[PDB]
Amino acid sequence: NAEKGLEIAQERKARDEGWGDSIATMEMILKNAQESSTRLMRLKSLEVEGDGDKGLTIFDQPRDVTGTAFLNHSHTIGADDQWLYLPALKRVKRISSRNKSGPFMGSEFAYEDLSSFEIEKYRFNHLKDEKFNGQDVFVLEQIPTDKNSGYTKQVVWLDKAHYRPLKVEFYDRKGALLKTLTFANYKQYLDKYWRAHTMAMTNHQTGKSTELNTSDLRFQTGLEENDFNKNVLKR
How far is Cα of residue 209 from the mean position of the Cα atoms in its chain? 15
**Can you tell me the distance from the alpha carbon of 53 to that of 47, in angstroms, rounded to the nearest whole number?**
5
| Residue nearest to Mg ion according to CB distances in the complex | 129
Least distance from Mg ion to the Cβ atom of residue 180, Å: 21
Q: What are 165's strand-pairing partners? A: 158
Q: Is 172 annotated as a binding residue?
A: no
For residue 16, the tally of other CB atoms under 10 A from its CB is 18
Distance, C-alpha 88 to centroid of its chain: 26
Cα atoms in the 13 Å half-sphere on the side-chain side of 79: 14
Q: How many CB atoms lie within 10 A of CB 149?
A: 21
Encoded one letter per residue, x for contact with Mg ion by CB under 5 A and - for no contact, window 126-165 reads ---x------------------------------------
Assess 216 for contact with Mg ion (CB under 5 A).
Answer: no
Comparison of 5 and 150: residue with beta carbon closer to Mg ion = 5
Q: Is 191 annotated as a binding residue?
A: no
* Contacts with Mg ion, 82-121, as mask; x by CB under 5 A: ----------------------------------------
Q: Are 142 and 124 in contact (CB under 8 A)?
A: yes
> Which residue, 129 or 216, has its beta carbon nearer to Mg ion?
129
State which residue, 11 or 129, has the beta carbon closest to Mg ion. Answer: 129
How many residues bind Mg ion (CB under 5 A)? The answer is: 1
Compute the least distance from the CB of residue 125 to Mg ion, in Å. 11
* Residue 9, SS3 per DSSP: helix
What is the distance between the alpha carbons of residues 186 and 199, in angstroms, rounded to a whole number? Answer: 10
The distance of closest approach from Cβ of residue 155 to Mg ion in the complex, given in angstroms and rounded to an integer, is 13
CB of 167 to Mg ion, least distance (A): 16
Nearest approach, Cβ of 186 to Mg ion (angstroms)? 22
Rank residues 95 and 168 by Cβ distance to Mg ion and give the closer one: 168
Task: Note whether 139 and 127 are within 8 A (CB).
Answer: yes
| Alpha carbon distances (Å) from 98 to 26, 60, 81, 172 | 28, 29, 12, 16
Of 129, 131, 93, 99, nearest to 112 (Cα)?
99
Smallest separation, CB 139 to Mg ion (Å): 7
Window 114-133: residues binding Mg ion (CB under 5 A): 129
Q: Which residues bind Mg ion (CB under 5 A)?
A: 129
What residues are designated binding site for Mg(2+)? 126, 129
* Residues making up the binding site: 126, 129
